[PDB]
Amino acid sequence: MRVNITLACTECGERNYISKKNKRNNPDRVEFKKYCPRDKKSTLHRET
Amino acid sequence: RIAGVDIPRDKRVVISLTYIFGIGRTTAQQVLKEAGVSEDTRVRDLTEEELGKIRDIIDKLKVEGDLRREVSLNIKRLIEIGSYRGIRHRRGLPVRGQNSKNNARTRK
């Protein structure tokens, strides 16, 4: 059953991103590599 | 192994040879008496020359599939002869003649 996830950036703390994920298929905390407009580079993004 | 099928390993030869098809205790006794194995032998200790000569003497005797095909040939011969006794084998009833009502229970 899919749920909404906001993705806070690793070092700065600005989310800027939402996604859908299945907690049955991915019970872990997801790690992406996404552009952060405050940090001006692609940075690792944490599932909150 | 001997007739293409395996052998027990840790028992005497005069008993172990009875495992393979179509050969028996008295026959194994009378062949191994002239073979000279003293009727107590493990197969883990033997010689290749005595293994070869028992291989050819059990090769000459009627052991492996030939007894099966022989009795099959006689019994199918009895089927196309018919002649009552073949009907008894086809029906599964006892053949040598007995009281077919009381026990009759080894067959069918």
Partner: protein, 63 residues
Amino acid sequence: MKAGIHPNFKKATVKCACGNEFETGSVKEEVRVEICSECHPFYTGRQKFASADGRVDRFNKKY
């Protein structure tokens, strides 16, 4: 030819009960043979033992 997942084989030799030698590659190095092709009478032209076993009861009562 991916190394480490194929089992190794050596140049093995094949020894028969009649002393026949033959060559192959296998896991072992030398292999016993109980019965071989030229020892089995079925390969060697006509059969030798089942030729003697191939008789039938031709109504032989006369003795």
